[PDB]
Amino acid sequence: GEMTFSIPTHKCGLVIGRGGENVKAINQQTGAFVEISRQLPPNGDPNFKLFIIRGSPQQIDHAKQLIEEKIEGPLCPVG
């Protein structure tokens, strides 16, 4: 099951780069596809873009770690 994480819209330039650059490098490092979602977060606020780490748990969780390395902060599993 693909997992969703809360990615701040303002941080879409460090982890997301310009058009999802760094996120696909995460994929290469892991295996799961870290793709930008169109889902509304629990808060329904447009400053929190949901991010899809779609793959197998082992790949997702490892990619999660790499993103939490990018932002150097904890990501919350949403859905």
UniProtKB/Swiss-Prot annotation:
Organism (species): Homo sapiens (Human)
Annotated positions of the Phosphoserine modification: S56
Function: Binds to the dendritic targeting element and may play a role in mRNA trafficking. Part of a ternary complex that binds to the downstream control sequence (DCS) of the pre-mRNA. Mediates exon inclusion in transcripts that are subject to tissue-specific alternative splicing. May interact with single-stranded DNA from the far-upstream element (FUSE). May activate gene expression. Also involved in degradation of inherently unstable mRNAs that contain AU-rich elements (AREs) in their 3'-UTR, possibly by recruiting degradation machinery to ARE-containing mRNAs.
Subunit-level organization: Part of a ternary complex containing FUBP2, PTBP1, PTBP2 and HNRPH1. Interacts with PARN. Interacts with PQBP1.
Tissue/organ expression: Detected in neural and non-neural cell lines.
UniProt subcellular location: Nucleus; Cytoplasm
KH domain residues: 1-67
Family membership noted in the UniProt record: Belongs to the KHSRP family.
Entry superkingdom: Eukaryota
Underlying gene: KHSRP
Free-text note regarding domains: KH domains KH 3 and KH 4 behave as independent binding modules and can interact with different regions of the AU-rich RNA targets of degradation.
Coiled coil stretches, renumbered: none
Residues recorded with modification Omega-N-methylarginine: R18
Signal peptide bounds: none
Protein's name in the database: Far upstream element-binding protein 2
